[PDB]
Amino acid sequence: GEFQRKLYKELVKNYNPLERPVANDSQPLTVYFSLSLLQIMDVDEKNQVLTTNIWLQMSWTDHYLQWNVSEYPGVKTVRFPDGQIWKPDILLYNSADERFDATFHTNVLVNSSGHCQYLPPGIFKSSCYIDVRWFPFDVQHCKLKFGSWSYGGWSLDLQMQEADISGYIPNGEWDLVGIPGKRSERFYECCKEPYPDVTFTVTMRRRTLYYGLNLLIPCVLISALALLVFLLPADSGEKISLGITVLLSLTVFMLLVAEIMPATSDSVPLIAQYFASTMIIVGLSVVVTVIVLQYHHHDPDGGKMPKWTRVILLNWCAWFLRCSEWKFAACVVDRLCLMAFSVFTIICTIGILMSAPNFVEAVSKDF
Amino acid sequence: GEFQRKLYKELVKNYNPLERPVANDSQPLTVYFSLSLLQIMDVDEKNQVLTTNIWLQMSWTDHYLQWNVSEYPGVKTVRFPDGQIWKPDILLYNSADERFDATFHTNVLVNSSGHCQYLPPGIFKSSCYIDVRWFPFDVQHCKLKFGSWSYGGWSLDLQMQEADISGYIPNGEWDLVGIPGKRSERFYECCKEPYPDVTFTVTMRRRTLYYGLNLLIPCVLISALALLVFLLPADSGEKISLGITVLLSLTVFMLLVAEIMPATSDSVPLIAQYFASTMIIVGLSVVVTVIVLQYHHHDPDGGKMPKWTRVILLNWCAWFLRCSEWKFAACVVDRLCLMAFSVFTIICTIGILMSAPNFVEAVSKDF
Amino acid sequence: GEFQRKLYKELVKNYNPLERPVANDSQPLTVYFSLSLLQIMDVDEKNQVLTTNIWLQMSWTDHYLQWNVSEYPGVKTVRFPDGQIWKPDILLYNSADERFDATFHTNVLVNSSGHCQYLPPGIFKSSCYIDVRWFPFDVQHCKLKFGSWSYGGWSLDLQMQEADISGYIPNGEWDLVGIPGKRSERFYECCKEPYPDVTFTVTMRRRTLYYGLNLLIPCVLISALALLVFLLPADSGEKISLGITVLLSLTVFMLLVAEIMPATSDSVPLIAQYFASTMIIVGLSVVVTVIVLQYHHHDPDGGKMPKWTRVILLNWCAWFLRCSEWKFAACVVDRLCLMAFSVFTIICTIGILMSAPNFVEAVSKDF
Amino acid sequence: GEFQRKLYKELVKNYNPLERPVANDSQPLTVYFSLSLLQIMDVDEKNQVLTTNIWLQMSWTDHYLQWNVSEYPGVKTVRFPDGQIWKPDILLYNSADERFDATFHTNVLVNSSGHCQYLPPGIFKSSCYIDVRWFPFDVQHCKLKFGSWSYGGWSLDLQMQEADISGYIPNGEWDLVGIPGKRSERFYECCKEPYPDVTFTVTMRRRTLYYGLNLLIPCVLISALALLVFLLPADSGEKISLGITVLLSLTVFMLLVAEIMPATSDSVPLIAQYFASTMIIVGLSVVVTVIVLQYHHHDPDGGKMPKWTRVILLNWCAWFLRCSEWKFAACVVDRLCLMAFSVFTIICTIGILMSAPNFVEAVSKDF
Amino acid sequence: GEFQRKLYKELVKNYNPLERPVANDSQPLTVYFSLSLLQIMDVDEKNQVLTTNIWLQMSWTDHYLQWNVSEYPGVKTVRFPDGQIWKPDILLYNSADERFDATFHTNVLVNSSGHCQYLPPGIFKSSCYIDVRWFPFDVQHCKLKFGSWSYGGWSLDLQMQEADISGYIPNGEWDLVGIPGKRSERFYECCKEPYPDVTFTVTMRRRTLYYGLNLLIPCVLISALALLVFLLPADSGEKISLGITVLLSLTVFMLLVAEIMPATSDSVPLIAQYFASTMIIVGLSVVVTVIVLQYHHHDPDGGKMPKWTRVILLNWCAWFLRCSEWKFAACVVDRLCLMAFSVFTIICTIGILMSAPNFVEAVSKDF
């Protein structure tokens, strides 16, 4: 309108996008970098990649994009696309995206004082170490490391502002504890110039109820069936079939769990160790029961001729609770297996009750 | 043709795409923003992202793209590609797309009065909160928030026009109740200039029959089997195997349901709670029946020696309906479990009959 | 070669790609639009999107790209890339692609008379309504709607030529009946100028044998098992287990079918209704048999004390074919269920034998 | 270095990338097209698309990119990016890629004689007809059709050179027999100018052992179980359950096979026909055995009253090998079913032993 | 700031990005190429493609990008985007990416001496031969081959620097042994000019515990069940059903294994051969037991009439350990099958204990 056109013509008369916009070349350019978390799209524990929906916020002063408001009435701000003016090269250092730059290059808003505002949105994919050991009561500290790609501390004085979380959409699987930020420096051996960066640590807590019932109901059922087969009579007929079916069902369930979560060898989840203990206990009990039944139902003394087993079973039954002796030995072994399974379940429950994600507090908040 | 070429040469003589095309720089530019919904591609409840096929509609007046029709006979409209002329930076604020701009940049149609028309098509992916609690009788209000990225109310006077739905292709899984629109403002603490935006709320109702039979037939079958095992005699032989098989089948079905829909911890679906109640009832009944049978078939009084259980069962049988006492106690427990399951089914049906998506009206319209 | 270089320099001396190449600006530009179908990549019934491999064919006369062959010996054609010259903005209106333009922008072939040829290949993804109701004997009419995005009938006189199918690679799942074309106009209320478009209707017939055996063999097996359990004696022992296993297997098969095809609520497939009828019949028969066996094996008259059931069963047995009465009643009920299942199977076969995709003709052509 | 810079400035003084670089415009430009296969990424039998990793090789002489080596000491070659100089528009005609051009546009290497070298790498996706009928002993001839998009034989004299396979990485699922090439012409009715193209036929043989054990072990097991149930006594008790379980397992296996490979209706695989024959035989045998057992175990003559069945069974037993007659008839039927299954297995093995991929030679080479 | 702008204007006065920046054109340009491995994203054994997160490091001296620091106070470094200055065309030769260039083109950092630094990040997908034969104790040597695409050894003197691994994030499935580098030359028959390249061999060891328990627990269970059925009495009733169920479960497990890993025919994994041996042993044992039971339970001598079998079984029982003879023969056959299975398990364990990935050392380090 005879003023905006003239201003746009005048501002880019000799402007060079490659030049860092400072009046004095030996002075640093202060850039205020902030963040606006909006949504946690995905937490891939397989590839250790966190996907988030983030609006970056960058602000700096341009020495050449200044004008007198009185000389250009009615126009107070101008917009420049990607390549028209200089922008800081703030990139996510730990970006796992195949493009390495998920930001959408919007226009830079500059007002009459030369203050530029740049808010590039994007779906950032950052590679963070997923420590899945206290499954499912685990908290992940995924870091977002931002910094200038080719500017030092004496050229781009990067500064930090607290991230904005008043736009956040709850994920439904992870609970956002918070996203604190920190500014650190990267002094090199070559040179005394610092290399600042801004790191935002997305502290997230896994929501219990998402996997809670879906894993507890099968686990409760298989534990009840294990107790049942540890209490059923030896000569019941269906005990062997029930045990085999239970083992097949729970190993298919464990295969499904390993398909959903990754059973990373860096730190085996405690649930996997509990399952392994249950498997070895159930297998030993079933093998002992089957061999006793198949070696003592037809021959009264076919496998009972060793003396060491007889004396050790007598000592164990005297130290534990005190048709032939084979039935009593099988019952004692089954009771011992039941006691061991109960002790393991109790100790696992005790060890999982206390943790950094307080189980009692979590269930009180959820339920 | 000696007139279109001359007009195109004349129109871009001093035109600047960065300049907002207003005769007076202090006056707002009125932009009419409308929408044309065509198809609902996908409703991802996992990532809370809605995918739609939408044709945007933007209209504004350009002060510099005006010409005299008599001076240029035969030409009444001109087209300019993406970067040739100025276009409003209307973007989907809640876009979850990795590109953040799904629009296809078509040509801007300008006629002799300077009126520009811009209709960019695209497959928009917006992040909306999916409240899946009354599954499957749920209605989702997914919002599409459009607004200028870097213009205020005194620069780009955004206006709303009612969305066009006379091109809509039915989804087959979701029923489109409607897409009302609203224009709101975003006054900041810094400044009195409003920041208008246009929000279209895609109100969608899940079609019943899509998941209806596929979830009812397994649910009806498992409920019938639960009633059967709650009515079968205790000493039937196959009762334990039937119960275990039923539990395995329905827990696999629940795993499939959790695979298809997300069991979000924000609000657990009522179907999940009903399944949990059925699971606890069936497990308790099976455990009680098995323990009674295994502790009373060989010993007439091996687990019946406690007095509290005997007196409480006598009181319950006197207050409910009034071979040894163990069979009668097992029958009473089984009848109580059947009654509890029937009451839970009835109350769940009553609570799910009434809702915002009226169940009776929905089935009347569908069937 | 001193002539091609000179011609290329001369042709683009004042050429404007934005100008429509007509000698008279008030005269329409005739553009002949044709199509060359090559392959049907995918038919997504979930999102209602058809993916095809298509070579477009556009021809028009350019007034400015003309030269004298004698003055430029040896050169008869020239090529111009995307942005060098004017091309019609013919786009797929119902494109479901995220880019909205799957065409690969090749060079435009222009000869000495100004006749331009443009053949952009691409993998088009168009959104067509998939009416899957007569599964698997269904024919889909997916339309490809092409037209100018910003030109009317008095500016771009779009014309149609018959599509070329002598390059088509058979899909193996769908049979191509044909792709007829049609040209229609879109008169607006504003103005009398028509808005022509060219629509190609890809009429495709699903090949029977692809899903034929894969669905018939499980269906034949489950139908045979249903007849078997409807003919087996009540006191056989394995009847209940066989029925439960059959129901579980066929409901898993129906889950697989719903996973492969979409059970759209717009029109439920007839196979789904047949499965629902079979399910209700089998469930009723199994429930009746189980309740009769469990209420009459131990008590000669425990559930037979009502008079209405006895008299109605006597009337039914007198009107149908004419150890205690319970066995005869169970046999009569089982025979009635078998007869109902046979009638339903016969009527379903009769109703599916006749259709627009003639079943007898299809199997004669395939087998 | 005062010579490379001068040469680069001089070479592009009047160079036009649109001009075909020939001294005489009426003379063809000879382009030598070769190929360098590196890896067969994927063979999609569903969409009939072959994915390969290929380095193209194009060579031609540029008349204008010539210089005197003595006048420019030290520089013998120059490089030009995509748009700087002219390149042939050699494209894969049958490309199924959504971009239609998988080549990565590298620099063109030109030496002092004007000879240009262009080696664009890419991951080509070509649509070839997959004839999967002799599964798994099948050989696929997938063609790669390359040619100029807009040049005739009198403008671009395309020539063929033998493909290079000394970089090939074995796929592990397909064995590369060879990739012969051929040059053909495409004379049109309009004009006598030929339209040459270069076609490379990727002849590939499926490696036996990849699917060999994975399909043979289930097939061997189900065949052994079929023989077992065809040899087990009728009154064994578990015969019906074993047969039903075998049928369910093998139909799930066939569902898995149809999920992995496509059961295309163009030509049904022989394995599918063998499975159908086995299914009908097993179903008939099971139905006959069950009906005989259920109609003759309680009534000595309840279904044996027809005379035609009795006389035909007497004739068959006299012509085949020569408690009541029902057991003998059931045994004769079971033996006949076993003989039919054995004959079908033998004839299938004989017919699959001989083929273009010689089974004996293949197993000798592999084992 | 009156110095950076002047320097940027002066540096690109006559700069040509196509020219190789050397003072003398006949002298090679030394380029130091290094690598910085950060993460191993994926190891696809199906397509033989390795996905890694890598920061490249390239350094070279530019003759024209030099300036006097005193003449331009305060500015010591400059940045140029992709197309502004010359960069080496170092590409991954064995790249399997569809783009062939995963690098993100950042700015080139040049200081006053003309020394340029280029650090392009990217997610590289390279095609390496995956030799999966000693599953799961296998080490993969995946090579990353980098080199100039169109420069010889006398033009681009490529040099190697040791890769940096102090940023590496552990994968959790693969253990990084190391990434040694090597520089080699590619002399051609045409010419004596070498063609150097830099190859980094990513030596990776599969972590045991990732698949360890998940494959051992099913394998241990099926081995225990095989021993059980090889020790159970012949006339146990459930032996046949248990064997069939075990076979079905383990063949489903093998199908799952073939789904996860590829059973490549180049070299069959030892686990597959062990499974095949177990399958043939179990099948033979089950068939022999079933045929003996079905041919000797009703007829004392119905299949024992041959003399060769009787004499060979007598010899075997005399050479092995020394109701009718059929039971003793069945027991001897079952014991022989058990012994063969035990020998095969022992020899497989012995052969898998020793390997390049030392099993004992690996389990000592992990456990």
Ligand SMILES: *[C@@H]1O[C@H](CO)[C@@H](O[C@@H]2O[C@H](CO)[C@@H](O)[C@H](O)[C@H]2NC(C)=O)[C@H](O)[C@H]1NC(C)=O
């Ligand atoms: C241009 O925009 C900047 C944005 O920061 C304005 O700077 C702010 O001005 C207010 C005065 O109302 C101060 O309270 C803030 O502290 C300033 N922020 C910073 C970072 O300096 C600046 O005033 C604007 N220019 C004009 C002419 O209005």
Ligand SMILES: *[C@@H]1O[C@H](CO)[C@@H](O[C@@H]2O[C@H](CO)[C@@H](O)[C@H](O)[C@H]2NC(C)=O)[C@H](O)[C@H]1NC(C)=O
């Ligand atoms: C250019 O196009 C605009 C499109 O809006 C025309 O403006 C409309 O003109 C009609 C008159 O037939 C009015 O009824 C509408 O209310 C106008 N709409 C708006 C938004 O102003 C305009 O007339 C066209 N110019 C010419 C010269 O025809």
Ligand SMILES: *[C@@H]1O[C@H](CO)[C@@H](O[C@@H]2O[C@H](CO)[C@@H](O)[C@H](O)[C@H]2NC(C)=O)[C@H](O)[C@H]1NC(C)=O
């Ligand atoms: C340029 O190409 C066009 C292609 O259509 C030629 O026009 C055709 O010419 C033939 C004469 O051999 C006629 O039979 C066709 O009917 C014409 N087609 C159309 C659409 O007009 C044209 O002749 C070519 N120019 C020259 C100089 O050869």
Ligand SMILES: *[C@@H]1O[C@H](CO)[C@@H](O[C@@H]2O[C@H](CO)[C@@H](O)[C@H](O)[C@H]2NC(C)=O)[C@H](O)[C@H]1NC(C)=O
């Ligand atoms: C430029 O490169 C071409 C590449 O082909 C050279 O042409 C080859 O030259 C050799 C001589 O050593 C002949 O044996 C080949 O037959 C030629 N090939 C072709 C296709 O003509 C050419 O000599 C090079 N120019 C210079 C000046 O060395």
Ligand SMILES: *[C@@H]1O[C@H](CO)[C@@H](O[C@@H]2O[C@H](CO)[C@@H](O)[C@H](O)[C@H]2NC(C)=O)[C@H](O)[C@H]1NC(C)=O
């Ligand atoms: C420009 O950067 C290069 C980076 O290598 C500098 O070269 C290094 O200079 C140091 C002196 O402090 C030497 O120890 C290294 O050996 C040099 N490296 C190489 C590869 O030559 C160079 O000095 C810098 N220029 C200026 C003016 O500081």
Ligand SMILES: *[C@@H]1O[C@H](CO)[C@@H](O)[C@H](O)[C@H]1NC(C)=O
């Ligand atoms: C802006 O212009 C006014 C006159 O229009 C003048 O008084 C004022 O000093 C100017 N400001 C600057 C910063 O030049």
Ligand SMILES: *[C@@H]1O[C@H](CO)[C@@H](O)[C@H](O)[C@H]1NC(C)=O
């Ligand atoms: C357009 O031109 C005609 C003469 O050709 C003139 O009468 C008319 O006033 C002009 N209109 C405008 C708006 O300049």
Ligand SMILES: *[C@@H]1O[C@H](CO)[C@@H](O)[C@H](O)[C@H]1NC(C)=O
């Ligand atoms: C082309 O040039 C020839 C002479 O070379 C002339 O006779 C002829 O008329 C010209 N044609 C046109 C259309 O100008």
Ligand SMILES: *[C@@H]1O[C@H](CO)[C@@H](O)[C@H](O)[C@H]1NC(C)=O
């Ligand atoms: C190249 O230059 C030399 C002199 O430097 C001259 O003798 C020779 O003829 C020239 N070659 C050509 C092809 O012009």
Ligand SMILES: *[C@@H]1O[C@H](CO)[C@@H](O)[C@H](O)[C@H]1NC(C)=O
């Ligand atoms: C740089 O400039 C200073 C004077 O400012 C001069 O003494 C010195 O020699 C110059 N260096 C070069 C390399 O030209």
Ligand SMILES: [Ca+2]
């Ligand atoms: Ca996840």
Ligand SMILES: [Ca+2]
């Ligand atoms: Ca499909």
Ligand SMILES: [Ca+2]
């Ligand atoms: Ca494949």
